[PDB]
């Protein structure tokens with residue numbers, strides 16, 4: 001495993017997702033409020049699935065070689081199996097916080113599915129120029145998600161409990177900044193133009209993934225907004 | 232891409248699914264009624280996922296070669312990844328229109344999963360005679376779905392708002408006729424007996440797919456039945 | 463098909479899952495109570511998906527060869543495609559019986575996903591020692607599920623209708639005993655240490671699968687607990 005230079009970042013990612021999972025699991029012990037239980041379940045699942053996929057990349061299972069540009073290129077496909085399930089869970093935490101209507105939840109989850117599925121097709125496409133077609137369609141689906149989070153969700157939170165509104169605004173801003181960096185890393189890294197080497201690309205996705213999953217969860221699960229209003 | 236004769240129908244399919252997606256997206260702008268939003272989300276997602284899969288077949292990603300009958304046969308597997316998600320969404324539009332109970336929705340979606348999953352196993356099976364075993368099991372699951380749509384759903388719609396009943400009856404009849412043609416095309420085309428060439432088979436599925444997705448959606452989203460009754 | 467010694471158990475499994483599906487389908491004819499319909503839909507789907515996967519193993523589609531330990535080893539991967547959908551359906555029957563809160567249902571289904579997904583990664587891993595790492599992570603996710611079924615669910619059932627409590631207690635005990643045997647069979651069989659031959663391993667999983675699906679369903683669907691209380 002140590003033969004690949006990016007191993008150290010996969011190992012550190014594995015450890016941090018593991019530790020984040022155990023922390024949120026212990027913290028959610030004994031919570032009995034039904035609304036809080038939903039947020040603890042969603043939020044604890046997200047680093048638990050990322051732990052399994054980081055471990056699969058560390059041990060070499062989650063890597064394949066894709067020929068493009070006359071080379072055999074190493075593509076970590078397990079990233080997409082993680083993000084297929086973890087990105088809609090993160091969006092569901094936001095939508096539940098603002099009591100989003102069911103049609104908006106379905107639009108967000110379906111656009112997220114299209115973003116990750118087209119990202120995976122782009123990562124495994126053997127004709128170099130067509131990789132960037134799939135990157136553009138996936139980016140258009142991310143822009144729809146970010147538009148709804150600012151022009152659908154923001155206007156509803158501002159009519160709810162003040163602690164729900166302030167917590168949503170922080171997590172919305174966290175999400176828009178961190179998720180917007182992923183298409184840029186892909187475009188400049190090994191899957192795209194090849195300017196940044198795989199070892200630095202792996203470091204960048206590790207910092208983004210721990211921030212967007214464990215950092216986001218620490219903010220949400222310390223908030224009063226996840227409990228029902230009660231005496 | 233132009234080396235395959237069926238390319239023109241894949242390109243036309245891509246364009247029509249793309250145009251249908253953009254039309255329904257613009258039309259659903261500003262709709263604020265929660266019931267209408269659910270139907271716009273479901274109905275807009277369906278040509279958006281079909282657009283991505285038609286594009287994957289145009290560019291060659293969604294094609295594999297399966298050896299059977301002593302030949303290498305071209306099988307477009309991306310059709311099944313589209314229909315795995317788009318066929319239950321179309322059934323959910325019908326079920327929501329009639330306020331179907333949750334047990335019936337689960338039976339319809341699960342039978343649909345079995346229909347498409349066994350269709351895919353049949354399309355990729357290398358022993359020729361066994362392809363038709365999977366076709367028969369998939370057809371039996373389609374007959375269950377059509378039985379419920381006529382002997383479960385029809386009897387509930389007739390007790391609801393008149394505009395919900397008339398709109399359901401039209402979309403039910405559209406769905407029964409168009410979906411019944413898919414097993415016949417598969418059986419006579421490249422996946423089955425091989426009587427109709429792949430270029431004509433691709434034309435037939437394009438006409439069916441645009442009719443069952445964009446045609447169905449134009450009927451539903453122009454109806455008063457998708458809005459709640461309000462003053 | 464008869465060239466593999468385990469064929470007879472795959473054929474018997476196919477038949478029993480087929481017969482169980484047809485029995486539950488006929489029995490659920492005419493049931494009109496909405497709560498009972500949910501349990502019939504969930505419970506009938508489970509042997510129907512297992513029938514398709516047993517048939518795929520009988521015909522040879524659901525088998526692949528994985529090199530580990532210097533051999534090419536036969537791994538029936540279709541077991542995991544069955545259990546990915548059938549194990550959360552069985553857990554949903556239990557959760558609905560006790561009216562479990564939505565956060566607990568999500569935790570159970572997500573832990574179940576992690577159990578089966580890591581089991582599949584373990585079954586297809588080519589480095590022998592790492593197969594047992596994935597077995598341990600999957601077993602830890604099963605222990606979480608069993609903890610919730612005894613220390614979350616048992617305490618809620620005891621506050622509901624007496625027939626719901628007694629039926630849950632029986633099905634909980636059935637589930638804990640039969641599901642705990644699966645990791646032991648995997649560890650001693652072809653996927654693991656290789657002490658028990660594939661033909662006996664296949665017999666063991668057939669007896670467990672029919673008991674945990676058709677046996678469990680016969681107990682549940684004969685119970686008064688699946689109907690709403692009504693005059």
Ligand SMILES: CCCCCCCC/C=C/CCCCCCCC(=O)OC[C@H](O)CO
Nearest residue numbers: 196197199200201203204205206207208211
């Ligand atoms: C939260 C507290 C922790 C804060 C931590 C945030 C750091 C995020 C990582 C960043 C990029 C740095 C990557 C290291 C740069 C190596 C690039 C390089 O030097 O390549 C040289 C090559 O030889 C010729 O260009």
Ligand SMILES: CCCCCCCC/C=C/CCCCCCCC(=O)OC[C@H](O)CO
Nearest residue numbers: 427428430431432434435436437438439442
């Ligand atoms: C809605 C308004 C639009 C209406 C449009 C509906 C048409 C649907 C397509 C049909 C089949 C026609 C396929 C073309 C037939 C070619 C078959 C053929 O001629 O093969 C000849 C071969 O050389 C010896 O058999």
Ligand SMILES: CCCCCCCC/C=C/CCCCCCCC(=O)OC[C@H](O)CO
Nearest residue numbers: 658659661662663665666667668669670673
């Ligand atoms: C519900 C009523 C039905 C009750 C049925 C429950 C049986 C479950 C199966 C069990 C294991 C028996 C497997 C047969 C044992 C064969 C092992 C063997 O003998 O291997 C010999 C080898 O030559 C040297 O060890």
Ligand SMILES: CCCCCCCC/C=C\CCCCCCCC(=O)OC[C@H](O)CO
Nearest residue numbers: 018021037040041044048565566569603606
């Ligand atoms: C080094 C440590 C390794 C890291 C751990 C390995 C992760 C894979 C194992 C298990 C799934 C465990 C459960 C995941 C679901 C927990 C959901 C939850 O917390 O639900 C709370 C809610 O309140 C309930 O009602």
Ligand SMILES: CCCCCCCC/C=C\CCCCCCCC(=O)OC[C@H](O)CO
Nearest residue numbers: 084085088089092100101102105106109113
């Ligand atoms: C593979 C990619 C897709 C699967 C990945 C899993 C991610 C979560 C799934 C779906 C959102 C579906 C809609 C669920 C929103 C319901 C929330 C709500 O509005 O409330 C309903 C509840 O009944 C009030 O108590």
Ligand SMILES: CCCCCCCC/C=C\CCCCCCCC(=O)OC[C@H](O)CO
Nearest residue numbers: 109110113114117118121280283295312316
């Ligand atoms: C309400 C639920 C909404 C659900 C929204 C989901 C939409 C998914 C969209 C797109 C891409 C699907 C791509 C399928 C990925 C297959 C890639 C693969 O595995 O290819 C293997 C091999 O290399 C080649 O044969």
Ligand SMILES: CCCCCCCC/C=C\CCCCCCCC(=O)OC[C@H](O)CO
Nearest residue numbers: 139143146179180181183184187188193195
């Ligand atoms: C709204 C927040 C989300 C927005 C996210 C989308 C932003 C995409 C931006 C830019 C593309 C810049 C293209 C630069 C690529 C040129 C690569 C190249 O070929 O140059 C070779 C290299 O630079 C020689 O050293």
Ligand SMILES: CCCCCCCC/C=C\CCCCCCCC(=O)OC[C@H](O)CO
Nearest residue numbers: 103104107141144249252268271272275279
């Ligand atoms: C040539 C044009 C190409 C075709 C376009 C590329 C398709 C892939 C891109 C994006 C997903 C965009 C969003 C799909 C989900 C829209 C859901 C919706 O409309 O929801 C309305 C509801 O009212 C809300 O609350």
Ligand SMILES: CCCCCCCC/C=C\CCCCCCCC(=O)OC[C@H](O)CO
Nearest residue numbers: 315316319320323331332333336337340344
């Ligand atoms: C991969 C194949 C499966 C996944 C493909 C995605 C297709 C849509 C999924 C599921 C239907 C599940 C049941 C949902 C029906 C609920 C509708 C209802 O009855 O109303 C509930 C709501 O709470 C009242 O406001």
Ligand SMILES: CCCCCCCC/C=C\CCCCCCCC(=O)OC[C@H](O)CO
Nearest residue numbers: 340341344345348349352511514526543547
């Ligand atoms: C409530 C939710 C209900 C959900 C109902 C879903 C039931 C799905 C049924 C069947 C077929 C599954 C077939 C699995 C397809 C794998 C095909 C494949 O990819 O094979 C690749 C390669 O060629 C070989 O190793």
Ligand SMILES: CCCCCCCC/C=C\CCCCCCCC(=O)OC[C@H](O)CO
Nearest residue numbers: 370374377410411412414415418419424426
């Ligand atoms: C209820 C609505 C849905 C019903 C959908 C199911 C209908 C299936 C019907 C028929 C099979 C006809 C079989 C014809 C195939 C014979 C092919 C053959 O071998 O003939 C060679 C060729 O004809 C020499 O030119």
Ligand SMILES: CCCCCCCC/C=C\CCCCCCCC(=O)OC[C@H](O)CO
Nearest residue numbers: 334335338372375480483499502503506510
């Ligand atoms: C030898 C016999 C072979 C075995 C049979 C082949 C299985 C694959 C075929 C079909 C799916 C049929 C329907 C599966 C879903 C049934 C759900 C149900 O029973 O729902 C009842 C509920 O009351 C409703 O409202």
Ligand SMILES: CCCCCCCC/C=C\CCCCCCCC(=O)OC[C@H](O)CO
Nearest residue numbers: 546547550551554562563564567568571575
């Ligand atoms: C691929 C692995 C995952 C997919 C496999 C399919 C298995 C079933 C799925 C999900 C449970 C999601 C939560 C559903 C629990 C809702 C039940 C409930 O509490 O009641 C709600 C209803 O609105 C009151 O009438």
Ligand SMILES: CCCCCCCC/C=C\CCCCCCCC(=O)OC[C@H](O)CO
Nearest residue numbers: 049052064081085571572575576579580583
């Ligand atoms: C609320 C919903 C909760 C959902 C919880 C789901 C968590 C799934 C976890 C893990 C493993 C995923 C493993 C992906 C399996 C891919 C195996 C494969 O097909 O590999 C093919 C080939 O051999 C190699 O390239």
Ligand SMILES: CCCCCCCC/C=C\CCCCCCCC(=O)OC[C@H](O)CO
Nearest residue numbers: 601605608641642643645646649650655657
């Ligand atoms: C709580 C209910 C669920 C608990 C489920 C987890 C139980 C796992 C137990 C034990 C491992 C025993 C290990 C024995 C394996 C040693 C194999 C070996 O190498 O021995 C060679 C062979 O015995 C020469 O004939």
Ligand SMILES: *C/C=C(C)/C=C/C=C(C)/C=C/C1=C(C)CCCC1(C)C
Nearest residue numbers: 119135138139142179182183186212
């Ligand atoms: C837990 C990990 C998270 C929040 C990952 C987020 C990932 C995305 C927002 C990925 C976006 C992509 C594009 C928009 C285009 C090209 C490739 C992707 C998949 C990296």
